[PDB]
Amino acid sequence: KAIRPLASATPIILDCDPGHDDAISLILALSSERLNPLAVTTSAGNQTPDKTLNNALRILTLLNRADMPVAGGAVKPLARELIIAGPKLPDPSFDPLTQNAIELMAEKVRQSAVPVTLVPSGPLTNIALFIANYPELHSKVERIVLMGGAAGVGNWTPAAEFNIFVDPEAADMVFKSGIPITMCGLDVTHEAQIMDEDIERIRAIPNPVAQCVAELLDFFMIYHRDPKWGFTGAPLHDPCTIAWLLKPELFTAQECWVGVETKGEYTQGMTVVDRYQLTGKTANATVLFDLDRQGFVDLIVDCLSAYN
Amino acid sequence: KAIRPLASATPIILDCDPGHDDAISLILALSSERLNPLAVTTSAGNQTPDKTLNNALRILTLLNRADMPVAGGAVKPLARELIIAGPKLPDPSFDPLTQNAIELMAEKVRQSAVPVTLVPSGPLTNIALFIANYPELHSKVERIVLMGGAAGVGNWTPAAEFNIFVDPEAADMVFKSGIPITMCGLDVTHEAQIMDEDIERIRAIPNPVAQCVAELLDFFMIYHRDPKWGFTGAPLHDPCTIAWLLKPELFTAQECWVGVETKGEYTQGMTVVDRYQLTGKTANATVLFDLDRQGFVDLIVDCLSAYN
Amino acid sequence: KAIRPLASATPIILDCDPGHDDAISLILALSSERLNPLAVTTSAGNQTPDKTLNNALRILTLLNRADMPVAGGAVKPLARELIIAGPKLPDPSFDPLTQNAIELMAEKVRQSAVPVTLVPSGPLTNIALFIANYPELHSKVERIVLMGGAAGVGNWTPAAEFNIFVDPEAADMVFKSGIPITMCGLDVTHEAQIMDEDIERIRAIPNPVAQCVAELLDFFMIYHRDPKWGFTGAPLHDPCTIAWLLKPELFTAQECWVGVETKGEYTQGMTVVDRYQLTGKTANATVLFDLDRQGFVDLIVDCLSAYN
Amino acid sequence: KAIRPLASATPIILDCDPGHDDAISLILALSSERLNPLAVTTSAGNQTPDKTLNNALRILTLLNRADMPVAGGAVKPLARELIIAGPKLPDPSFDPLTQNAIELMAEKVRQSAVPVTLVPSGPLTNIALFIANYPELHSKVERIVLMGGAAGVGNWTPAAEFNIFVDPEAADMVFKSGIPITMCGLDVTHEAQIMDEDIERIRAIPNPVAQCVAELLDFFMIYHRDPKWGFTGAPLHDPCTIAWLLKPELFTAQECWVGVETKGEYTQGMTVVDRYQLTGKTANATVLFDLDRQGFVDLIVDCLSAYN
Ligand SMILES: [Ca+2]
Ligand SMILES: [Ca+2]
Ligand SMILES: [Ca+2]
Ligand SMILES: [Ca+2]
């Protein structure tokens, strides 16, 4: 039940730190014949790297994709330590590659005729290492489509979103790289809420993978709706990256200058997004600000049907 | 036509850098028998201090209040230089006091039986100097009700509001002072929009002072509505401080920890507002987030009628 | 036994946080008819402000100078808290002025025909407040002769000297002020060592004040010679300011650009001294780097004889 | 005339940005049967990476070592741009490996039974990338012996030495890595001066390689003795790393905590060296503070004789 990519599919590399949001992202990416996932690499944020790698293997096992090249990446942020303080996935059916993660990225990028899109959904540690170590491959990277950041209001500190906060230095390197970026930050993901009726649509999709996703969403309904945020349904974060790859017209986007703060007393990890063109600086990212929520749900339902 | 404060009025000191927003603030403050303005002191942000002092004198002349103690304050921010790059007020009918501005503040605060509310509407330079120099008077300061800051999105840099940006060090000292604060930032002032029909109500008030305010608003309609902000009407900033003094129930408020960033690469002048209680830090300000816009207009109309 | 200043004496204001180094400084300043001390103001660093003020009163009592205007200054640094963690002076014979310290400074500076030299020997908190609050008096300040800083190697943190570290913001304001500065930092004070034979010369001076100084030096010999510093004798810090006022030819000096670091992770409170002209920035201080140690001792002995 | 390492030699990797100091370092390293150079990798600081790689090839050609694995490294610092603004070496006789530089480092480190010493003499960019990307190899790195830093007084900015200043982020990562470090900073290299008579000793060594070194030193005598530094002879910087590997007893060393400043206004690139144990922090580097200069010259003369 592996989905075969079209020859004309967008080649991508998925760099992720799964828990559960990432899991849904991987499930959506691997459901689409419009995408060609060349490899999965793992990052670490608030779980040990052994755990995120194991979780990636469990997700790939769920999807019967033991053929997917997978490698564990950096064990900690570039210049800081990890910040360590649900429903069950199947036990892994296979072992990961022992190959170094950015070596694996370079191999796939070098070998791909078509420039590759990097899709990180955790801290940007591995992406930064790749950018800094393989300058000759930048022309073979189409874009970096990342989940991270917030154009003003953080969810980890008042100024910073979690993925960026974990490794501000890595994020800084990404935004300075000159490679095209699409930033899917909290501004859009806060709007990507799943309602009860949306979960029931997903649960009605007649395959095991949809059942897994619906269970994850049930869990999010209970534990990802702290009333202080004022959510009606549970937001989905990481899957917004895949939705943008598949149907970018779902999104309100603007080309902006974005800087990552690495020096402030209170603001380390902030993405400073010049939405109102106050700085005069050249835009370095496509920043997503809103989405067609119903269209997003429709896309998820359509995607998961591929596993029927 | 001077408005006589009630014996039970709230004593205040108005510290301001007028241009035109401040002018409306002073006009509203001096219209109310519920407030007792003890002095006016001037700060400087994007005009020379000679100009802001002259403008304060012109406003007080408009209001026939040459009795008001007025003194020019600091000529520049504490640790930075000024950032220097409309309709007409009457020429001044009187000279300012030569007394030092924070000496004048201390005199009035020391002499007031009732603790005094400081009401800054420009950079916080003079307020910080007062706080640091007169620790023995902190118990005689009720509150600092300031226009400044933004809980995430600036209007001068992407992270910072103008008044705070001009003098982040001064602002930092204010927020660290332990004196109660009400912060009227861009979050609320962006909502305090004046519509065409609101201006026409004000213009219909049968006195010269209302005519002046309506002319200022006409000007704001043309030049303070850069379409990028997406305003329907022209926002009023500084007058929100006076509205909070007179009718705080117009506002949505929350007790928050607020820190001022003075060290970041991209974020100097940001007010970091912990609206979602992520830091565990004790609240040091009442932050205003929304207001009853129609109620705000009604208050302005009622206030200006005092000059009939 | 008060020393009467010459009409042609250098007017000075002594701003200090005594413990014992400051005490010797005040004793030397008040011994010289070449200096005219207009007032003493107190700062606070690692003792409560009540203690430094009391100590100033005790020193002035020792010297039979209850006529000296004295006032306690700021109770804490501008943007930080105090860092709180010997032989006995006489009990105070008089009370301090209740006048605000920078108001007292302004009064004396305004009243002095001759521009006044400010001589701080503790954190620069009061000096910064004066500079920022009284811009119109800058032309009546000759120079600021301060004990503080180090051109590379701190004694409190690896990068910072104590006085600057206590209040980096205040120090920053001083060095940005445009008022001439002489910086007597650790580079020179480390060389200003008092040997056993020097103490015995001082002790032989036939008056009570010299006896007090010799006792202070005995104490320094025991407790101010941590072997890690590699001192042969006990350094005298604050008195180097007075020695520079009286006999500047004792010193090796160079005009340098100096910046105070207020933003770094590890370097807050550092004085960045461009001794090797690497920055291209205009010099803002006379920095002292070495002294004629024997000449310094000779000056002290000559000074203390004035109390005979 | 290749020098064959002893089986018991110290394995090293030389990471360098040659101009001329590095050249002398490579010449000394490759002269010693006590060292086993596994590879040469190039960094870039104030010359384009094509130039430093070419220069490394020219040095290896001089030494008849076309067998040495050599690879060009990062083309720019991690989070900053390069800072771009003598006698002749032979034209290269061979091409470099096309292999990625940190992949080459990992290959040699993984293959070496004996833990390897990394010896950087330029910006620490490649070393940081290796540390962050290959955590599993840290136990196979004996030590990092680097030329860089200064315990208080910089040669590029007042606070920072050049190699660290070029890439403070990389340096920060090195000092945080937990791998043993020997820091050969300006404190020691300033003392490593070559006198006229020392050059003439070297020139008398009867082989072409010594003649080359003497010519480089002649050049240094003219252009590396800006009188502001107060040098008597021309300092040698990078070769101090090799001297420490061969004869560490030439040096005065102390175990210190060292932090790299990446956030300050004036102090970015500073190495903050806690020589006086003020911070309580655990030591992370052996810092060199002085050397036996004559012994250093004697070592150089003895080394260059290996090419006879
Ligand atoms: Ca994730
Ligand atoms: Ca204003
Ligand atoms: Ca002192
Ligand atoms: Ca070098």
TrEMBL record, chains A, B, C, D:
Residues 12-297 form the Inosine/uridine-preferring nucleoside hydrolase domain. It comes from the Bacteria. Its EC number is 3.2.-.-. Signal peptide: none annotated. Ca(2+) binds at D17, D22, S121, D238. Hydrolyzes cytidine or uridine to ribose and cytosine or uracil, respectively. This is Pyrimidine-specific ribonucleoside hydrolase RihA. It is an enzyme of class 3 (hydrolase). One of its GO terms (cellular component) is cytosol. GO terms for biological process: nucleobase-containing small molecule interconversion; purine nucleoside catabolic process; pyrimidine nucleobase metabolic process. One of its GO terms (molecular function) is uridine nucleosidase activity. Keywords: Calcium, Glycosidase, Hydrolase, Metal-binding. Belongs to the IUNH family. RihA subfamily. The active site is at H237. Gene3D superfamilies: Ribonucleoside hydrolase-like. It comes from Shewanella loihica (strain ATCC BAA-1088 / PV-4).
